[PDB]
Design a protein around this ligand. Sequence first.
Ligand SMILES: Nc1ncnc2c1ncn2[C@@H]1O[C@H](CSCC[C@H](N)C(=O)O)[C@@H](O)[C@H]1O
Ligand SMILES: CNc1cc(C)c(C(N)=O)c[n+]1C
Length: 254
Amino acid sequence: GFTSKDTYLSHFNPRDYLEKYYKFGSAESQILKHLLKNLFKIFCLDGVKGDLLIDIGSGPTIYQLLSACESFKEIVVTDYSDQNLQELEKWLKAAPAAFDWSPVVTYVCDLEGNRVKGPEKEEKLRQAVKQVLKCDVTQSQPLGAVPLPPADCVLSTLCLDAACPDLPTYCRALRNLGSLLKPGGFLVIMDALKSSYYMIGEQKFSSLPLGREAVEAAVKEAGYTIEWFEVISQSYSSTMANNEGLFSLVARKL
Ligand SMILES: Nc1ncnc2c1ncn2[C@@H]1O[C@H](CSCC[C@H](N)C(=O)O)[C@@H](O)[C@H]1O
Ligand SMILES: CNc1cc(C)c(C(N)=O)c[n+]1C
């Protein structure tokens, strides 16, 4: 009774997803602001840095990487959907048909103290992203046959509830992402709480409805130690999903 992963290849419209959730012109904008403040805190205020960050289930979005590119030499973006990766690549290659992230970029520049302007920030992100890869979090080797050095950080925003049909798969996915991480490496997860679906227009997608206790327990079971865990009550618009807030966590691999 859960969305099949092949539905992501064919029925997840990347430009419609961006239009629906990331236009930043709403509950969606309030959530985006909070996600950005947390990412800024992690990568710029806390010591989350290194040579390599792997972003898991990036979809067609870059917002989750804007603060990260200040702290990581290389960012690898990954997703199950080739269509999502193509939409991402349109922005990376600064193509005229690319999504306009400029209000989000400006917001991050403001958070970071206006040290740089939008164009410099976008260029820094474009230079950090060297690889755009296929991933499947449900597999023991999420990146398949593709070899990568162990990462300093694995980040995943709004992916794991959508990718995991049940709690045992969710715990296994956390172990699978851990295989990409160096010992003592950072795991950064942000996702919806108690959400059983989300919509992109008329297209419905399943979500695993987890509470904060189940998320914490799965992260400890998967071999991590939690540094901090935050719950926000703000939910997406009623037309989009049925979540009861969002969580953010930073953990280290044992
Ligand atoms: N098994 C799986 N492994 C990896 N990615 C998967 C997956 N099942 C679904 N996904 C991806 O999970 C994403 C959910 S959308 C979240 C996109 C983005 N990180 C954001 O913050 O908005 C989609 O891009 C979808 O292709
Ligand atoms: C904004 N993107 C969202 C939003 C929600 C609420 C869910 C979910 N897990 O229900 C998944 N995605 C990918």
